[PDB]
Amino acid sequence: SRDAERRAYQWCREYLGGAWRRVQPEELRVYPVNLLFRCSLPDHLPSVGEEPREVLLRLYGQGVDSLVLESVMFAILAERSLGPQLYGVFPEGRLEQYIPSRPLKTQELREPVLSAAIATKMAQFHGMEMPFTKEPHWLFGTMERYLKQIQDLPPTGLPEMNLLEMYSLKDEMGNLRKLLESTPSPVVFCHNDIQEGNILLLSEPDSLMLVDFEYSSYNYRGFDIGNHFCEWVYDYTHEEWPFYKARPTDYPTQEQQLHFIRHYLAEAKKGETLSQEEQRKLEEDLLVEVSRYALASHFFWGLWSILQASMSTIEFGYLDYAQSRFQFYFQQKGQL
Amino acid sequence: SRDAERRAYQWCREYLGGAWRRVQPEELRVYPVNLLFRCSLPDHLPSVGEEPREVLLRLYGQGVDSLVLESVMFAILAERSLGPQLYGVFPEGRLEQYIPSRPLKTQELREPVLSAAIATKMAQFHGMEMPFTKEPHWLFGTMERYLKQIQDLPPTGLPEMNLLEMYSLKDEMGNLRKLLESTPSPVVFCHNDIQEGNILLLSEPDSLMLVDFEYSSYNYRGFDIGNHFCEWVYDYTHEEWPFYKARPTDYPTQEQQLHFIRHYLAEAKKGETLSQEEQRKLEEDLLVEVSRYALASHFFWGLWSILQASMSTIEFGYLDYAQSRFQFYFQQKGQL
Ligand SMILES: C[N+](C)(CCOP(=O)(O)O)CC(=O)c1ccc(-c2ccc([C@@]3(O)C[N+](C)(C)CCO3)cc2)cc1
Ligand SMILES: C[N+](C)(CCOP(=O)(O)O)CC(=O)c1ccc(-c2ccc([C@@]3(O)C[N+](C)(C)CCO3)cc2)cc1
Ligand SMILES: Nc1ncnc2c1ncn2[C@@H]1O[C@H](COP(=O)(O)OP(=O)(O)O)[C@@H](O)[C@H]1O
Ligand SMILES: Nc1ncnc2c1ncn2[C@@H]1O[C@H](COP(=O)(O)OP(=O)(O)O)[C@@H](O)[C@H]1O
Ligand SMILES: [Mg+2]
Ligand SMILES: [Mg+2]
């Protein structure tokens, strides 16, 4: 649309500057990749200074405090080379670095060399000191909030038993909390959504970059790792309803888990002098830690998915997905 | 107050973490330095990780968008070692690094070695790419806004001629705009308030750090330099009403101006191959540039001061100060 093009043009000229000042409106069109759009400097123009030639316009399409935290977080991760560079912030959105790349696919997560690189990157992320609350209320605080939001949803006319009741989730949350309370896991700065779609394979390699910090917070290490392992099971590119596919046998084997964990710990502990024996203990303990915190991935996203279903119709089977996550929760809990 | 102490304690524990978790309430008291407070970790406690032992709590005591920009800016300057580190952001304020230091005094600005260091630091600041509007509307946009705000002030009962009328400021703004429009000055990321009080002399030296980014924006280089030169004249520590003192003969001489400019340009142009002749031209041009943009410092702060006067009584002579700035404006304009 004319208006959308004009706004993008203005934002690029104003926030990027440099060569962008020389761009004529007729030479720039936005490309959707929807709230996300690519903008590229015309080939004929040389860059002036360090201003980027390739950006993504992200439109917000959220509380004040929330927006402050989100923007500060993005800005800091950019400075630390853990996210895309930040070129403009304005009321409607932001301008970010377009990272030349493609996202990983579900099946690629299991490849040993990529898996090692993901583990290293996650550990790097977990090394960050960020100016946010360090108290680990995010996990159960968010789940408790989601549960309350679900309880408060207006009835829709759908006749099925409420998933909260079918799976006894209010009670089960207490059961999960008790299990996890018995399971030490250090509190670190977590991504919280390290799925394939958020892992960019760089065309100009440090071979990967994480994106999508919507859910990031100080949280239990075990959640970030366990959540990533859960993602090995789900492909969100499936072309028929419900528009995801679960392959439970694709959950990582013990050997695949340990491979990841060894590389994670190599990065996390790189500044430390540890014996082979101490290292093995750290690995074994982390295996157990993750086996329990992985359950929280199912619980968390199942609750989140019920809420998504309340805002959805036929574009994705959110309720179906929720039920998949809760089924796997009880299966894997039973397998501990 | 009990409540203030409790909040500070909670914020420190929650946002700083580490050793702060071990602090008992009875061991921590805030020290005013008022919206700014020092918090120090008890001596007996060892640090756990990289969490700071010495912080400043800054209470806000402002629009959403404004707060986003302010916080992003602070966070970025911290990452780039151009401002204090940022340890917490929350609705009420922030936690910052306490920089072991003291502020400069007015008279110290003229010392050649310090002046050279200030010039270098200002040029460093001007090297920053920041995710904010690059269009230079800040100067006249802000002054136009201030003028409109002054026009809209409720009458108070004070009988004196309005300074806008006494100094024909609406007309004069157009005169200034025309002069500056004829005066090239590159648009860079400016501090906009490089007064002595905002220049910290480090106790653990890079010998200085700037603080107070309230006014920072993309703006004309000439304003930042000229404003700094104006500050050589004013001491805001004067102990009798109006609680500032002006010493007009303390404005930098041509030689003092050129000393500063040489050091500024040495930093600004460090990546460039310039002949002695080209360098001298850059210096001479900058001298003229600054001589004109310095006038905008008087105008800007005079307008700002009228607004401050509307919220003040006996704590500082804002209207008196405004009149000082406007008098010097017309004097220095006449001397061009
Ligand atoms: C577990 N997970 C990490 C939760 C957080 O998701 P995000 O990372 O915020 O996406 C992923 C997840 O639950 C998820 C991921 C993707 C999708 C999704 C994928 C595709 C579509 C779709 O493009 C499918 N469609 C093309 C057939 C119609 C338009 O909508 C809609 C939704 C739905 C759910
Ligand atoms: C030109 N300037 C850079 C404008 C921006 O000021 P800020 O950097 O935001 O302070 C500085 C300026 O105009 C200014 C700077 C300081 C003061 C000021 C200094 C001291 C006080 C004072 O502490 C004086 N008092 C102790 C006698 C009573 C309480 O208020 C009040 C105001 C007033 C004005
Ligand atoms: N900075 C970037 N450069 C290139 N591609 C990106 C960038 N950020 C996100 N993407 C891609 O765009 C898609 C959505 O971006 P993301 O930040 O994950 O938003 P969301 O998942 O909430 O829509 C992802 O597939 C991701 O691979
Ligand atoms: N991070 C810091 N560490 C130590 N002192 C500081 C720090 N920030 C500000 N100060 C000092 O506190 C005073 C006020 O801080 P500043 O940021 O300039 O706020 P404002 O001038 O708006 O009150 C200044 O005198 C400055 O020297
Ligand atoms: Mg994403
Ligand atoms: Mg200050």
PDB file of all heavy atoms in Angstrom, chain A residues 14-15 64-65 69 71 79-80 87-89 91 131-134, chain B residues 14-15 64-65 69 79-80 87-89 91 131-134:
ATOM      1  N   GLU A  14      15.260   8.517   7.587  1.00  0.00           N
ATOM      2  CA  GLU A  14      15.399   9.232   8.856  1.00  0.00           C
ATOM      3  C   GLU A  14      16.285   8.517   9.869  1.00  0.00           C
ATOM      4  O   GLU A  14      17.133   9.123  10.527  1.00  0.00           O
ATOM      5  CB  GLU A  14      14.027   9.486   9.457  1.00  0.00           C
ATOM      6  CG  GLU A  14      14.076  10.079  10.789  1.00  0.00           C
ATOM      7  CD  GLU A  14      12.713  10.308  11.350  1.00  0.00           C
ATOM      8  OE1 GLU A  14      11.703   9.699  10.830  1.00  0.00           O
ATOM      9  OE2 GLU A  14      12.619  11.107  12.278  1.00  0.00           O
ATOM     10  N   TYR A  15      16.110   7.212   9.973  1.00  0.00           N
ATOM     11  CA  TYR A  15      16.828   6.438  10.995  1.00  0.00           C
ATOM     12  C   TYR A  15      18.116   5.834  10.471  1.00  0.00           C
ATOM     13  O   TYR A  15      19.051   5.601  11.242  1.00  0.00           O
ATOM     14  CB  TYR A  15      15.901   5.368  11.624  1.00  0.00           C
ATOM     15  CG  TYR A  15      14.890   5.972  12.517  1.00  0.00           C
ATOM     16  CD1 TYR A  15      13.715   6.402  12.026  1.00  0.00           C
ATOM     17  CD2 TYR A  15      15.137   6.147  13.867  1.00  0.00           C
ATOM     18  CE1 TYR A  15      12.778   7.046  12.822  1.00  0.00           C
ATOM     19  CE2 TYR A  15      14.214   6.759  14.694  1.00  0.00           C
ATOM     20  CZ  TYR A  15      13.031   7.220  14.172  1.00  0.00           C
ATOM     21  OH  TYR A  15      12.093   7.839  14.970  1.00  0.00           O
ATOM     22  N   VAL A  64       4.044  -0.015  28.509  1.00  0.00           N
ATOM     23  CA  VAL A  64       5.232   0.864  28.512  1.00  0.00           C
ATOM     24  C   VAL A  64       6.483   0.147  29.020  1.00  0.00           C
ATOM     25  O   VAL A  64       7.549   0.080  28.380  1.00  0.00           O
ATOM     26  CB  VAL A  64       5.029   2.069  29.484  1.00  0.00           C
ATOM     27  CG1 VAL A  64       6.246   2.976  29.458  1.00  0.00           C
ATOM     28  CG2 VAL A  64       3.729   2.839  29.162  1.00  0.00           C
ATOM     29  N   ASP A  65       6.337  -0.362  30.222  1.00  0.00           N
ATOM     30  CA  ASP A  65       7.438  -1.051  30.903  1.00  0.00           C
ATOM     31  C   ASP A  65       7.911  -2.240  30.094  1.00  0.00           C
ATOM     32  O   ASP A  65       9.094  -2.488  29.945  1.00  0.00           O
ATOM     33  CB  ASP A  65       7.018  -1.488  32.300  1.00  0.00           C
ATOM     34  CG  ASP A  65       6.578  -0.316  33.161  1.00  0.00           C
ATOM     35  OD1 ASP A  65       7.287   0.718  33.173  1.00  0.00           O
ATOM     36  OD2 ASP A  65       5.515  -0.420  33.809  1.00  0.00           O
ATOM     37  N   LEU A  69      11.682  -2.791  28.385  1.00  0.00           N
ATOM     38  CA  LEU A  69      12.515  -3.962  28.629  1.00  0.00           C
ATOM     39  C   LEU A  69      12.882  -4.646  27.328  1.00  0.00           C
ATOM     40  O   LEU A  69      14.021  -5.026  27.092  1.00  0.00           O
ATOM     41  CB  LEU A  69      11.811  -4.953  29.544  1.00  0.00           C
ATOM     42  CG  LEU A  69      11.492  -4.430  30.952  1.00  0.00           C
ATOM     43  CD1 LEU A  69      10.865  -5.536  31.762  1.00  0.00           C
ATOM     44  CD2 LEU A  69      12.745  -3.836  31.650  1.00  0.00           C
ATOM     45  N   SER A  71      13.054  -3.403  24.293  1.00  0.00           N
ATOM     46  CA  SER A  71      13.950  -2.607  23.457  1.00  0.00           C
ATOM     47  C   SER A  71      15.362  -2.538  24.015  1.00  0.00           C
ATOM     48  O   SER A  71      16.342  -2.646  23.294  1.00  0.00           O
ATOM     49  CB  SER A  71      13.386  -1.206  23.300  1.00  0.00           C
ATOM     50  OG  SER A  71      12.090  -1.292  22.724  1.00  0.00           O
ATOM     51  N   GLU A  79      24.663  -5.183  20.765  1.00  0.00           N
ATOM     52  CA  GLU A  79      26.014  -4.739  21.118  1.00  0.00           C
ATOM     53  C   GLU A  79      26.942  -5.884  21.402  1.00  0.00           C
ATOM     54  O   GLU A  79      28.148  -5.818  21.125  1.00  0.00           O
ATOM     55  CB  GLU A  79      26.006  -3.795  22.321  1.00  0.00           C
ATOM     56  CG  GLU A  79      25.290  -2.475  22.052  1.00  0.00           C
ATOM     57  CD  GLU A  79      25.945  -1.649  20.951  1.00  0.00           C
ATOM     58  OE1 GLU A  79      27.193  -1.489  20.965  1.00  0.00           O
ATOM     59  OE2 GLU A  79      25.179  -1.139  20.112  1.00  0.00           O
ATOM     60  N   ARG A  80      26.398  -6.951  21.934  1.00  0.00           N
ATOM     61  CA  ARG A  80      27.183  -8.135  22.326  1.00  0.00           C
ATOM     62  C   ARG A  80      27.249  -9.207  21.284  1.00  0.00           C
ATOM     63  O   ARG A  80      27.759 -10.301  21.539  1.00  0.00           O
ATOM     64  CB  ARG A  80      26.677  -8.678  23.615  1.00  0.00           C
ATOM     65  CG  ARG A  80      26.845  -7.620  24.688  1.00  0.00           C
ATOM     66  CD  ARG A  80      26.498  -8.127  26.006  1.00  0.00           C
ATOM     67  NE  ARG A  80      26.402  -7.119  27.029  1.00  0.00           N
ATOM     68  CZ  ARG A  80      25.805  -7.351  28.190  1.00  0.00           C
ATOM     69  NH1 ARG A  80      25.404  -8.564  28.510  1.00  0.00           N
ATOM     70  NH2 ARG A  80      25.641  -6.370  29.023  1.00  0.00           N
ATOM     71  N   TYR A  87      18.940  -0.383  14.365  1.00  0.00           N
ATOM     72  CA  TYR A  87      19.165   0.839  13.611  1.00  0.00           C
ATOM     73  C   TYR A  87      18.120   1.930  13.788  1.00  0.00           C
ATOM     74  O   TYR A  87      18.370   3.077  13.470  1.00  0.00           O
ATOM     75  CB  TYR A  87      19.355   0.515  12.161  1.00  0.00           C
ATOM     76  CG  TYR A  87      20.551  -0.342  11.895  1.00  0.00           C
ATOM     77  CD1 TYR A  87      20.389  -1.606  11.401  1.00  0.00           C
ATOM     78  CD2 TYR A  87      21.841   0.112  12.142  1.00  0.00           C
ATOM     79  CE1 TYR A  87      21.466  -2.406  11.145  1.00  0.00           C
ATOM     80  CE2 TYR A  87      22.927  -0.686  11.899  1.00  0.00           C
ATOM     81  CZ  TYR A  87      22.729  -1.965  11.424  1.00  0.00           C
ATOM     82  OH  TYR A  87      23.785  -2.811  11.156  1.00  0.00           O
ATOM     83  N   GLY A  88      16.962   1.571  14.323  1.00  0.00           N
ATOM     84  CA  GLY A  88      15.930   2.562  14.619  1.00  0.00           C
ATOM     85  C   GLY A  88      14.898   2.029  15.577  1.00  0.00           C
ATOM     86  O   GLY A  88      14.504   0.883  15.465  1.00  0.00           O
ATOM     87  N   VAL A  89      14.495   2.895  16.509  1.00  0.00           N
ATOM     88  CA  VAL A  89      13.362   2.622  17.391  1.00  0.00           C
ATOM     89  C   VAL A  89      12.436   3.818  17.361  1.00  0.00           C
ATOM     90  O   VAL A  89      12.838   4.980  17.450  1.00  0.00           O
ATOM     91  CB  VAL A  89      13.750   2.257  18.846  1.00  0.00           C
ATOM     92  CG1 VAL A  89      14.398   0.881  18.887  1.00  0.00           C
ATOM     93  CG2 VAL A  89      14.652   3.304  19.437  1.00  0.00           C
ATOM     94  N   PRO A  91       7.757   4.708  17.583  1.00  0.00           N
ATOM     95  CA  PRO A  91       6.584   4.165  18.264  1.00  0.00           C
ATOM     96  C   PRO A  91       5.956   2.926  17.590  1.00  0.00           C
ATOM     97  O   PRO A  91       5.450   2.024  18.263  1.00  0.00           O
ATOM     98  CB  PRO A  91       5.632   5.376  18.292  1.00  0.00           C
ATOM     99  CG  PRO A  91       6.581   6.576  18.420  1.00  0.00           C
ATOM    100  CD  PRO A  91       7.730   6.187  17.504  1.00  0.00           C
ATOM    101  N   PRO A 131      20.109  -6.302  32.474  1.00  0.00           N
ATOM    102  CA  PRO A 131      19.609  -5.436  33.576  1.00  0.00           C
ATOM    103  C   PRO A 131      18.160  -5.676  33.969  1.00  0.00           C
ATOM    104  O   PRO A 131      17.377  -4.743  34.120  1.00  0.00           O
ATOM    105  CB  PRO A 131      19.806  -4.023  33.008  1.00  0.00           C
ATOM    106  CG  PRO A 131      19.649  -4.182  31.547  1.00  0.00           C
ATOM    107  CD  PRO A 131      20.265  -5.549  31.217  1.00  0.00           C
ATOM    108  N   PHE A 132      17.875  -6.951  34.143  1.00  0.00           N
ATOM    109  CA  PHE A 132      16.515  -7.426  34.393  1.00  0.00           C
ATOM    110  C   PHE A 132      16.491  -8.255  35.660  1.00  0.00           C
ATOM    111  O   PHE A 132      17.506  -8.648  36.180  1.00  0.00           O
ATOM    112  CB  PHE A 132      16.007  -8.251  33.211  1.00  0.00           C
ATOM    113  CG  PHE A 132      16.159  -7.544  31.883  1.00  0.00           C
ATOM    114  CD1 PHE A 132      16.754  -8.162  30.802  1.00  0.00           C
ATOM    115  CD2 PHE A 132      15.753  -6.251  31.743  1.00  0.00           C
ATOM    116  CE1 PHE A 132      16.925  -7.506  29.597  1.00  0.00           C
ATOM    117  CE2 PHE A 132      15.945  -5.581  30.544  1.00  0.00           C
ATOM    118  CZ  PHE A 132      16.521  -6.204  29.481  1.00  0.00           C
ATOM    119  N   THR A 133      15.294  -8.488  36.147  1.00  0.00           N
ATOM    120  CA  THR A 133      15.127  -9.233  37.395  1.00  0.00           C
ATOM    121  C   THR A 133      15.784 -10.592  37.292  1.00  0.00           C
ATOM    122  O   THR A 133      15.603 -11.309  36.302  1.00  0.00           O
ATOM    123  CB  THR A 133      13.628  -9.387  37.768  1.00  0.00           C
ATOM    124  OG1 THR A 133      13.523 -10.106  38.984  1.00  0.00           O
ATOM    125  CG2 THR A 133      12.815 -10.090  36.700  1.00  0.00           C
ATOM    126  N   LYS A 134      16.542 -10.926  38.331  1.00  0.00           N
ATOM    127  CA  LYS A 134      17.291 -12.172  38.399  1.00  0.00           C
ATOM    128  C   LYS A 134      16.549 -13.242  39.173  1.00  0.00           C
ATOM    129  O   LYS A 134      16.961 -14.386  39.253  1.00  0.00           O
ATOM    130  CB  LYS A 134      18.664 -11.954  39.053  1.00  0.00           C
ATOM    131  CG  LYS A 134      19.470 -10.738  38.638  1.00  0.00           C
ATOM    132  CD  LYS A 134      20.198 -11.012  37.422  1.00  0.00           C
ATOM    133  CE  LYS A 134      21.149  -9.852  36.990  1.00  0.00           C
ATOM    134  NZ  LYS A 134      20.384  -8.662  36.592  1.00  0.00           N
TER     135      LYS A 134
ATOM    136  N   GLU B  14      17.255  -8.006  43.780  1.00  0.00           N
ATOM    137  CA  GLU B  14      16.559  -8.557  42.618  1.00  0.00           C
ATOM    138  C   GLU B  14      17.284  -8.317  41.298  1.00  0.00           C
ATOM    139  O   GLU B  14      17.407  -9.209  40.457  1.00  0.00           O
ATOM    140  CB  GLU B  14      15.151  -7.990  42.544  1.00  0.00           C
ATOM    141  CG  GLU B  14      14.428  -8.385  41.339  1.00  0.00           C
ATOM    142  CD  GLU B  14      13.054  -7.807  41.298  1.00  0.00           C
ATOM    143  OE1 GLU B  14      12.760  -6.814  42.065  1.00  0.00           O
ATOM    144  OE2 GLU B  14      12.247  -8.340  40.541  1.00  0.00           O
ATOM    145  N   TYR B  15      17.798  -7.111  41.131  1.00  0.00           N
ATOM    146  CA  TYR B  15      18.420  -6.733  39.855  1.00  0.00           C
ATOM    147  C   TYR B  15      19.920  -6.950  39.849  1.00  0.00           C
ATOM    148  O   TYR B  15      20.512  -7.168  38.788  1.00  0.00           O
ATOM    149  CB  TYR B  15      18.045  -5.278  39.472  1.00  0.00           C
ATOM    150  CG  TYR B  15      16.637  -5.169  39.038  1.00  0.00           C
ATOM    151  CD1 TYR B  15      15.659  -4.965  39.938  1.00  0.00           C
ATOM    152  CD2 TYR B  15      16.281  -5.313  37.708  1.00  0.00           C
ATOM    153  CE1 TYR B  15      14.320  -4.938  39.574  1.00  0.00           C
ATOM    154  CE2 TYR B  15      14.960  -5.262  37.307  1.00  0.00           C
ATOM    155  CZ  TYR B  15      13.970  -5.083  38.241  1.00  0.00           C
ATOM    156  OH  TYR B  15      12.642  -5.033  37.874  1.00  0.00           O
ATOM    157  N   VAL B  64       5.906   7.180  27.140  1.00  0.00           N
ATOM    158  CA  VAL B  64       6.371   5.813  26.823  1.00  0.00           C
ATOM    159  C   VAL B  64       7.553   5.813  25.854  1.00  0.00           C
ATOM    160  O   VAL B  64       8.637   5.246  26.086  1.00  0.00           O
ATOM    161  CB  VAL B  64       5.251   4.999  26.102  1.00  0.00           C
ATOM    162  CG1 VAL B  64       5.734   3.590  25.805  1.00  0.00           C
ATOM    163  CG2 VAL B  64       3.940   4.999  26.919  1.00  0.00           C
ATOM    164  N   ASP B  65       7.300   6.440  24.728  1.00  0.00           N
ATOM    165  CA  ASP B  65       8.292   6.511  23.649  1.00  0.00           C
ATOM    166  C   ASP B  65       9.559   7.187  24.128  1.00  0.00           C
ATOM    167  O   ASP B  65      10.664   6.761  23.843  1.00  0.00           O
ATOM    168  CB  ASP B  65       7.721   7.241  22.440  1.00  0.00           C
ATOM    169  CG  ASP B  65       6.471   6.567  21.900  1.00  0.00           C
ATOM    170  OD1 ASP B  65       6.477   5.322  21.752  1.00  0.00           O
ATOM    171  OD2 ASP B  65       5.476   7.277  21.642  1.00  0.00           O
ATOM    172  N   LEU B  69      13.372   5.503  24.398  1.00  0.00           N
ATOM    173  CA  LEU B  69      14.554   6.079  23.771  1.00  0.00           C
ATOM    174  C   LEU B  69      15.640   6.335  24.797  1.00  0.00           C
ATOM    175  O   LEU B  69      16.808   6.034  24.595  1.00  0.00           O
ATOM    176  CB  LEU B  69      14.215   7.378  23.055  1.00  0.00           C
ATOM    177  CG  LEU B  69      13.216   7.243  21.897  1.00  0.00           C
ATOM    178  CD1 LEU B  69      13.034   8.588  21.240  1.00  0.00           C
ATOM    179  CD2 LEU B  69      13.647   6.152  20.879  1.00  0.00           C
ATOM    180  N   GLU B  79      27.341  -0.052  26.905  1.00  0.00           N
ATOM    181  CA  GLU B  79      28.043  -1.102  26.162  1.00  0.00           C
ATOM    182  C   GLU B  79      29.274  -0.593  25.469  1.00  0.00           C
ATOM    183  O   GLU B  79      30.274  -1.310  25.327  1.00  0.00           O
ATOM    184  CB  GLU B  79      27.135  -1.776  25.133  1.00  0.00           C
ATOM    185  CG  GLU B  79      25.974  -2.542  25.758  1.00  0.00           C
ATOM    186  CD  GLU B  79      26.423  -3.694  26.650  1.00  0.00           C
ATOM    187  OE1 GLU B  79      27.309  -4.483  26.231  1.00  0.00           O
ATOM    188  OE2 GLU B  79      25.841  -3.806  27.745  1.00  0.00           O
ATOM    189  N   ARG B  80      29.229   0.648  25.049  1.00  0.00           N
ATOM    190  CA  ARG B  80      30.332   1.274  24.298  1.00  0.00           C
ATOM    191  C   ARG B  80      31.298   2.043  25.144  1.00  0.00           C
ATOM    192  O   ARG B  80      32.185   2.724  24.624  1.00  0.00           O
ATOM    193  CB  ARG B  80      29.786   2.128  23.209  1.00  0.00           C
ATOM    194  CG  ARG B  80      28.999   1.252  22.254  1.00  0.00           C
ATOM    195  CD  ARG B  80      28.549   1.994  21.087  1.00  0.00           C
ATOM    196  NE  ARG B  80      27.600   1.295  20.262  1.00  0.00           N
ATOM    197  CZ  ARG B  80      26.863   1.920  19.354  1.00  0.00           C
ATOM    198  NH1 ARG B  80      27.078   3.188  19.069  1.00  0.00           N
ATOM    199  NH2 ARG B  80      25.938   1.261  18.728  1.00  0.00           N
ATOM    200  N   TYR B  87      22.513  -1.741  35.307  1.00  0.00           N
ATOM    201  CA  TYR B  87      22.301  -2.967  36.058  1.00  0.00           C
ATOM    202  C   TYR B  87      20.853  -3.323  36.355  1.00  0.00           C
ATOM    203  O   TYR B  87      20.553  -4.455  36.682  1.00  0.00           O
ATOM    204  CB  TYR B  87      23.110  -2.937  37.319  1.00  0.00           C
ATOM    205  CG  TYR B  87      24.584  -2.868  37.078  1.00  0.00           C
ATOM    206  CD1 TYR B  87      25.288  -1.764  37.470  1.00  0.00           C
ATOM    207  CD2 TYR B  87      25.270  -3.905  36.456  1.00  0.00           C
ATOM    208  CE1 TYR B  87      26.636  -1.679  37.265  1.00  0.00           C
ATOM    209  CE2 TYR B  87      26.619  -3.825  36.237  1.00  0.00           C
ATOM    210  CZ  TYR B  87      27.297  -2.687  36.622  1.00  0.00           C
ATOM    211  OH  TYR B  87      28.656  -2.554  36.431  1.00  0.00           O
ATOM    212  N   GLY B  88      19.956  -2.358  36.209  1.00  0.00           N
ATOM    213  CA  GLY B  88      18.529  -2.624  36.380  1.00  0.00           C
ATOM    214  C   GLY B  88      17.679  -1.536  35.778  1.00  0.00           C
ATOM    215  O   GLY B  88      18.012  -0.372  35.903  1.00  0.00           O
ATOM    216  N   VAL B  89      16.595  -1.964  35.129  1.00  0.00           N
ATOM    217  CA  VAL B  89      15.556  -1.050  34.659  1.00  0.00           C
ATOM    218  C   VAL B  89      14.214  -1.578  35.119  1.00  0.00           C
ATOM    219  O   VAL B  89      13.888  -2.762  35.016  1.00  0.00           O
ATOM    220  CB  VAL B  89      15.558  -0.800  33.130  1.00  0.00           C
ATOM    221  CG1 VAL B  89      16.773   0.026  32.736  1.00  0.00           C
ATOM    222  CG2 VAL B  89      15.513  -2.100  32.376  1.00  0.00           C
ATOM    223  N   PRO B  91      10.017   0.150  36.581  1.00  0.00           N
ATOM    224  CA  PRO B  91       9.156   1.293  36.286  1.00  0.00           C
ATOM    225  C   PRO B  91       9.544   2.603  37.006  1.00  0.00           C
ATOM    226  O   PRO B  91       9.395   3.697  36.457  1.00  0.00           O
ATOM    227  CB  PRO B  91       7.768   0.772  36.703  1.00  0.00           C
ATOM    228  CG  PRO B  91       7.836  -0.728  36.381  1.00  0.00           C
ATOM    229  CD  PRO B  91       9.246  -1.094  36.812  1.00  0.00           C
ATOM    230  N   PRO B 131      20.415   4.451  17.374  1.00  0.00           N
ATOM    231  CA  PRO B 131      19.198   4.092  16.598  1.00  0.00           C
ATOM    232  C   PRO B 131      18.059   5.095  16.695  1.00  0.00           C
ATOM    233  O   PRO B 131      16.906   4.733  16.912  1.00  0.00           O
ATOM    234  CB  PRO B 131      18.801   2.738  17.204  1.00  0.00           C
ATOM    235  CG  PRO B 131      19.256   2.809  18.608  1.00  0.00           C
ATOM    236  CD  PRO B 131      20.566   3.608  18.572  1.00  0.00           C
ATOM    237  N   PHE B 132      18.447   6.340  16.502  1.00  0.00           N
ATOM    238  CA  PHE B 132      17.550   7.480  16.681  1.00  0.00           C
ATOM    239  C   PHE B 132      17.539   8.320  15.420  1.00  0.00           C
ATOM    240  O   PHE B 132      18.362   8.170  14.552  1.00  0.00           O
ATOM    241  CB  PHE B 132      17.986   8.327  17.877  1.00  0.00           C
ATOM    242  CG  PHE B 132      18.182   7.517  19.138  1.00  0.00           C
ATOM    243  CD1 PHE B 132      19.336   7.619  19.887  1.00  0.00           C
ATOM    244  CD2 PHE B 132      17.233   6.624  19.535  1.00  0.00           C
ATOM    245  CE1 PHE B 132      19.533   6.855  21.023  1.00  0.00           C
ATOM    246  CE2 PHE B 132      17.436   5.837  20.659  1.00  0.00           C
ATOM    247  CZ  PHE B 132      18.572   5.955  21.397  1.00  0.00           C
ATOM    248  N   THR B 133      16.562   9.194  15.346  1.00  0.00           N
ATOM    249  CA  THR B 133      16.401  10.035  14.160  1.00  0.00           C
ATOM    250  C   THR B 133      17.662  10.829  13.899  1.00  0.00           C
ATOM    251  O   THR B 133      18.231  11.432  14.815  1.00  0.00           O
ATOM    252  CB  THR B 133      15.184  10.991  14.302  1.00  0.00           C
ATOM    253  OG1 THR B 133      15.070  11.774  13.128  1.00  0.00           O
ATOM    254  CG2 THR B 133      15.280  11.905  15.507  1.00  0.00           C
ATOM    255  N   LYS B 134      18.079  10.816  12.637  1.00  0.00           N
ATOM    256  CA  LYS B 134      19.295  11.483  12.196  1.00  0.00           C
ATOM    257  C   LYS B 134      19.016  12.854  11.616  1.00  0.00           C
ATOM    258  O   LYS B 134      19.911  13.613  11.288  1.00  0.00           O
ATOM    259  CB  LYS B 134      20.032  10.643  11.142  1.00  0.00           C
ATOM    260  CG  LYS B 134      20.162   9.151  11.380  1.00  0.00           C
ATOM    261  CD  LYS B 134      21.286   8.879  12.244  1.00  0.00           C
ATOM    262  CE  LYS B 134      21.565   7.356  12.442  1.00  0.00           C
ATOM    263  NZ  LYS B 134      20.478   6.712  13.192  1.00  0.00           N
TER     264      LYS B 134
END
